[PDB]
Amino acid sequence: SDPFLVLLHSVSSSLSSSELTELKYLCLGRVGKRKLERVQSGLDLFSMLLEQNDLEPGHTELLRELLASLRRHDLLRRVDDFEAGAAAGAAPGEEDLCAAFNVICDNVGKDWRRLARQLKVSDTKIDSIEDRYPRNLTERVRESLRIWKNTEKENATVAHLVGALRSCQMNLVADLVQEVQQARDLQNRSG
């Protein structure tokens, strides 16, 4: 029940029925026959491409290609501001993620070196960071968390962090974060 996705639903509901039809087809190289044929409503592009992650509830640059193509600049500009500047709780997954991340942040092993690799923080950074601060905790925990929430901010889903937590091997908080995930995903993916 997400404010950005509401807005996505709201641009779809501001569009005519041919245009929805056309949009389905015209995405030839992006939605192909099988994916094409099965979807029901006008929303069901929007529904799917969120689902498969062609966009997120942060920025939808790809979706804004589609909006642009179908002329309506009016629809664009409201959506544009949302993505440009008003990304405060726009993806609402971040908060329970941040909650969980705060919890993980408190109990820390020297394993942010493995973990930053595993999550795919860039190796040229890792190599340097490793060399720079070998034995220490402090600048590692600050680097690793900052670079992760820089890198995977637009793909901050709880599964990343669930997997990440377990890598650091704090098991008590693991099951806690898992129920954070389980209840949160279910309710929020639903609509």
UniProtKB/Swiss-Prot annotation:
GO molecular function, a single term: identical protein binding
Outcome of swapping C105W: In IEHDCM; reduced folding stability as measured by differential scanning calorimetry of the mutant protein; impairs interaction with FAS
Mutagenesis / variant outcome for changing D44R: Loss of interaction with CASP8. Abolishes induction of apoptosis. Decreased interaction with FAS
Occurrences of domain Death (ranges): 97-181
Main localisation: cytoplasm
Sequence ranges assigned to domain DED in this UniProt record: 3-81
Reported tissue expression: Expressed in a wide variety of tissues, except for peripheral blood mononuclear leukocytes.
UniProt feature coiled coil, ranges: none
GO biological process, one term: positive regulation of interleukin-8 production
Effect of R117E: Loss of interaction with FAS
Biological function: Apoptotic adapter molecule that recruits caspases CASP8 or CASP10 to the activated FAS/CD95 or TNFRSF1A/TNFR-1 receptors. The resulting aggregate called the death-inducing signaling complex (DISC) performs CASP8 proteolytic activation. Active CASP8 initiates the subsequent cascade of caspases mediating apoptosis. Involved in interferon-mediated antiviral immune response, playing a role in the positive regulation of interferon signaling.
Protein name: FAS-associated death domain protein
Organism: Homo sapiens
Higher taxonomy: Eukaryota, Metazoa, Chordata, Craniata, Vertebrata
Gene that produces this protein: FADD
